[PDB]
Every structure is written in structure tokens, then in C-alpha cells.
Amino acid sequence: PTQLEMAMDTMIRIFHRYSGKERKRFKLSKGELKLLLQRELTEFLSCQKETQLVDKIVQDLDANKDNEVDFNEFVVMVAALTVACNDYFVEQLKKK
Amino acid sequence: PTQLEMAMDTMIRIFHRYSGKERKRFKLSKGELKLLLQRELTEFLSCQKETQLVDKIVQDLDANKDNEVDFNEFVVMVAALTVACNDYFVEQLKK
């Protein structure tokens, strides 16, 4: 497959790795989404404790842990979180 | 980076290389997207003749050539096209 298709396959796979067995495909509960981020992003617990933005996103996932998210919302979150965590990692390199 | 991060990296990267100059970052025009899909998906034009939905999207891409889509919309569409174009059942019919 092409590069785009292989990236898409990896993300759909990783999405449904955290899906409940009863849920409509391409949907997650916010609790499951939170577990996804803690396990599938680089040093997410470090990033989330030191960055107010990532912290407020994650605490909203806790408040509505049973509400469901679709694939679009998942893509919004991951893209925003990776951007915020990269700024955080880059700046930690200058502190180290 | 993790696998999810590298996968998202590949898509941001592909998204931006078909991006024009006049674009607020993380947005893309439906016309530019059509060029992206034709060159970045396997035999995209032939999947259009095999699925009704893929045909609909392409004609929406041409009717609103100058409307713009954000990055998540593009990713969601790619998820739709990859699911629709590489369906297990359809492919095993084309023996």
C-alpha cells in the first residue's frame, strides 16, 4: 500500500485496540480515549502533568468518561496533543 | 516517536506537501485534496468506478473546488476511502 494508506491502517488499528467490544465501530468512550493517550503517545504522563492545556483536556475526559467520541474527535485530540507535547519536549531539551 | 505519532506525522506531512501558499495551516482546498487522493491512494480512479460513495465524494470535490477542509476532515475522509476502496468482500470478488 501507499504511505497514506499504511498510516491510516495503523491509526484505525490503534483506535480499535482500545474500543469496547459492544461499541459501534469508529467510536470510543472518553475513558477509553484517555487510556489510548496514556499508552500510545510519547511520555504522555510527563507532558500532561506539566502542561495546563493537556491537563484540562484530560480532566474533561475524566468528567465525561462514558460519553462517546467518534473518529473525527479522536483525530482532533491526537493532533492537538502531539503539537502541544512536542513544544513541551523540545523545551525540555533546552532545560536538560 | 510512537507508532500512532509516526502515523499522524505521515499524514500531516502528506497534507502539507499538497498544501498551497494561501492556506491557513491545517486546511486544504477540495481541489488540492482531489490531487492528493489521486496520487496518494492506490489506483484511486478505479475505486471510483467500483463504489457509489467514492464517486459522490469526487464529484463534491469538483463542485466545491475552492472550499477548504481542515486536517481532521481530510483524515476522516481518508479513513472512509481506505475502508471503501479496500473492502475485504469486494476485493475477493475481483479474482
Complete DSSP assignment for B23-63:
--SSEEEHHHHHHHHHHHSTTHHHHHTT-HHHHHHHHHHHH
- Answer yes or no: are the C-beta atoms of A4 and B11 closer than 8 Å: yes
Nearest to B11 by CA among B48, B49, B37, B43: B37
Is the domain covering B1-95 a CATH 3.40.190.10 domain? no
What residues contact A51, with CB distance under 8 A and at least 6 apart? A84, A85, A88
Q: Please, are residues A87 and A56 in contact by the beta-carbon 8 Å criterion?
A: no
Question: Looking only at Cα atoms, what is the longest distance across chain A?
Answer: 46
Asked whether residue B32 is marked as a ligand-binding residue, the answer is yes
d(CA A56, CA A62): 10
Q: Do B82 and A9 touch (CB under 8 A)?
A: yes
User: First-to-last CA distance in chain B?
Assistant: 39
Query: Which residue has cell 469508529?
Result: A26
Superfamily of domain A1-96: EF-hand (1.10.238.10)
Q: Is B66 annotated as a binding residue?
A: yes
CA atoms of B61 and B27, how far apart (whole Å) = 15
- Interface check for A53 against chain B (CB to CB < 8 A): the answer is no
Of B3, B73, B79, the CB nearest to A12: B79
Collapse the DSSP code of A29 into the 3-class scheme (helix H, G, I; strand E, B; otherwise coil) and give the result: strand
Question: Of A3, A12, A82, which has the smallest distance from its Cβ to B8's Cβ?
Answer: A82
Comparing alpha-carbon positions, the chain A residue that sits nearest to B85 is A5
CB distance A4–B10 less than 8 Å? yes
Three-class DSSP category at B70: strand
DSSP state letters, A34-93: HHHHHHHSTTHHHHHHH-HHHHHHHHHHHHTTTSEEEHHHHHHHHHHHHHHHHHHHHHHH
Rounded to whole angstroms, how far apart are CA atoms B23 and B29? 8
Q: How was this structure determined?
A: X-ray
Asked whether A51 and A37 are in contact (CB, 8 A), the reply is no
How many pairs of residues across A and B have Cβ atoms under 8 Å apart?
Answer: 79
Is residue A29 within 8 Å of residue A73, measured between CB atoms?
no
- Kindly provide the resolution of this structure in angstroms, with one decimal: 2.3
